[PDB]
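Blackboard transcription, Thursday session:
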Amino acid sequence: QNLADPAYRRRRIIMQNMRDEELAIAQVEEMQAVSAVLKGKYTMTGEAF
Amino acid sequence: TTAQLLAANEQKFKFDPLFLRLFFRESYPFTTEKVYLSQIPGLVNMALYVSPIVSGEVIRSRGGSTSEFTPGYVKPKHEVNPQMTLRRLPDEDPQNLADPAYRRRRIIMQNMRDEELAIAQVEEMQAVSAVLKGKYTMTGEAFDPVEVDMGRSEENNITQSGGTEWSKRDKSTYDPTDDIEAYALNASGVVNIIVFDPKGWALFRSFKAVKEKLDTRRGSNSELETAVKDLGKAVSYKGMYGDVAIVVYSGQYVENGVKKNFLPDNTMVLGNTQARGLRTYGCIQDADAQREGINASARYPKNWVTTGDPAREFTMIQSAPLMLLADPDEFVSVQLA
Amino acid sequence: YHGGGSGFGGQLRSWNPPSESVDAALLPNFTRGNARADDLVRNNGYAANAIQLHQDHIVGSFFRLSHRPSWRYLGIGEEEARAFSREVEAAWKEFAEDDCCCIDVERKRTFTMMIREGVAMHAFNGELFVQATWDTSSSRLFRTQFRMVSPKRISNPNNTGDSRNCRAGVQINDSGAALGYYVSEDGYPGWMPQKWTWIPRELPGGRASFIHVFEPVEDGQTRGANVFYSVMEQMKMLDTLQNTQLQSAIVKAMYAATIESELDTQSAMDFILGANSQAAPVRLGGAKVPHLMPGDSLNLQTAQDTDNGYSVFEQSLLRYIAAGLGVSYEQLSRNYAQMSYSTARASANESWAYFMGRRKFVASRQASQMFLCWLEEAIVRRVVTLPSKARFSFQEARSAWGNCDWIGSGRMAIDGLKEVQEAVMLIEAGLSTYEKECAKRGDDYQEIFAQQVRETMERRAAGLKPPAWAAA
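(Written on the board underneath:)
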């Protein structure tokens, strides 16, 4: 009950997506930080990088 | 060899949405994957005689039925590219003349006109195929086939057969009124309008009794227009015939180059001028359209540039229409062979 | 009529502008025109000066209220009308020029700056939107707060091809009246999804909710046009010419001389320019007489005049720009060349006529509507009490109860003494009253009278000579 038209569902999807990217990048930053602290060096490699 | 363009006409075909206007009002846009229409039987078994001792046979309470439908999608589009702009247009003088930029704003304008006209034709055929017959099927090259099937009793859609053909029986000393009454006996509710087809009207009018119902001092109150009344318009609101209203509809739509008639070759459609009609418009499915916050609308227009080598500024309109008939037994369609 | 024909010798055979309404000739290019006008204001010396002149001359340092309800029409009696005017003026004075700046929801501007910013927005955008809101959670006496909305945020129906009734995001009824506007959200980060809201023009009770101010040109005009469409192109081209001429002058002045020789560059510049090898810098002290072998040579480059008639062309272009915008040429260009008294006075008059027109229309209308919107709230909250036996209620006569006049800053005289003698001479005859002469200096006569009647008391009590205006 109390449904919403798709113009609102699209916005909800958009916010949850943007929060997902922000969390992922924060996680990457923390991963670099821990390796920089626990050890002197860290390697930065990827599949297309 | 100078010149001047004094007159520049434009050609059109006979097009007016009579069937959509009369029977389909109160448009209801919806944001839903599928809509429901619910019918309830309402047949009451007669109270059978029962002895004062047995006291049995409880009666089932009546229960209705429903249906679900999915609206179709339609999207015409056009184009404009710099090549068409340079040469000239058939609607500007050799004198006067304009910069290339304005010819584009004229071509886009006529493209808009053609798009809206095509959508209107789709809506009108959508309505007419729903009035005449219970069901229609929307099919296309890339559109997966989906059909709409309102529940119309087989006893409607009556057509004439080896017997009782108006064409075969004599045009003098016979009545069409009794056949009209026998046909209209089926419809649920009163009938208030009859929508002929020019050939069907010509067949009906030639009867000797129908003339007699018009020129009688005290046997009727009907009045018609037997002579030629309308020759260029697509509608003809002729006079009443006793109680009903007589209408002749000759409207044309084009599929391929040729011109075709909406009403198929002398049909007659009994009906009520206040028939409950539904005009449902679905949800437009376009990413930019939902960016703007627009949904459950009709005629969403847009344009863009394609950044290709020849460029191009396209033009598109999207409708997603679907016309329903809340009660499909308030009409009676007759073939009139 | 040669004007509508081919032209003199066919020169005009390609100038065939389309005969289209103002809307169809403005709306498709609205956003780009607004953006270009903003770019001109933010990055050009003369456009900023023109906006500054608009704000400082039209409105000034203070924009004072003068309330004159029409008592004859209402039949309320002179003394009651005067007392009501005094009470309303005191209430407005306490609410408009406060220090906490609670007239504006953003708590950034007082009333005078709001009027000035409205005139500015009406200058380089041709419209202004003021939204009157409520904050019922507030504990202040007056809960009516105003907000200034940039015309960019009154977006269209999301830029889609629009229609007849819904134009430029301003919903319209069958006639030309406007029913409801569309407001957006200004998101600085640039990633939030945009949301559009509907704000109706008038509340059901008749109160003004969302205000639109502009001056139309033709029969139908949904949104106005700024005063830059006349002269943007010349302004940008003039700026480019200025920068290009400056860079060319610098390039021409950079290369002082030119050494022509056969030997090595280090040796050639060592033996001629005086640079020591112990590229190579040259000391700038003293006078030098180089010794040139037959092969070598020295040339002192000469440059053109740094400004070979550029200032006159600048003069012509600035004259054109000033003619387009509206202000005089001297104020825009700061030239102020030699001129007699008559020429300067004519210049000032020609500017002040337009300034008075703009002030009488835009600032006056905006101030009157805002004042009425506050006055309704003041009346309802019993903070101000209407006279009894009124022929109409406040609802039935909106303007008559609050028919108000505003006094702005007055002119700064070129001749300090001539204006004073003019005012005195007019007062001696019956041609002009005290209010008219005191208002041209932007002062209210009642305050002056009260100040004088306390000054005479102070002078009498302190033991000094009585003033000139005292009655013996």
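Lecturer's comment: The helical segments of chain A are 6-38.
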